[PDB]
């Protein structure tokens, strides 16, 4: 499913994401813009042999599993494919887990180069939440 950008604010609040971690939900909405465009069957693969899933492009070296990269983990304890659904929250549950992980937001690559010390409330503008 592709996500309107109001839309998904509203269930990211919905499922506890907003100021989770002290990141607002506009940082949030704007990590997703930039990693899938809202799309939550977006994949991409790296030169690794790693693949991302989803909404927040959740990394298979680490969080998931996809049954094709070598010797990693799955931190999260769910397919790789529990990251395309429609309702976000196997991405949701993931994405806490991820941001407690010691370097907050910056996992994600399109946060830090294009979100991060930005006025991320714009992303959440006009939205009734
Ligand atoms: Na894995």
Redesign the pocket.
Do not use: K
């Given at each position: 499913k592709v996500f309107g950008r109001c839309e998904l604010a509203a269930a990211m609040k919905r499922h506890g994401l907003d100021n989770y971690r002290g990141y607002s939900l506009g940082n949030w909405v704007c990590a997703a813009k930039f990693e899938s465009n809202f799309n939550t069957q977006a994949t991409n693969r790296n030169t690794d042999g790693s693949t991302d899933y989803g909404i927040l492009q959740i990394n298979?070296?680490?969080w998931?599993?996809?049954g094709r990269?070598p010797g990693?983990?799955?931190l999260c304890n769910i397919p790789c494919s529990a990251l395309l659904s429609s309702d976000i929250t196997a991405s949701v549950n993931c994405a806490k887990k991820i941001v407690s992980d010691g370097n907050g937001m910056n996992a994600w690559v399109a946060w830090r180069n294009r979100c991060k010390g930005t006025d991320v409330q714009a992303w959440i503008r006009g939205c009734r939440l």
């Open positions: 298979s070296r680490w998931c599993n996809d990269t990693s983990r799955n």
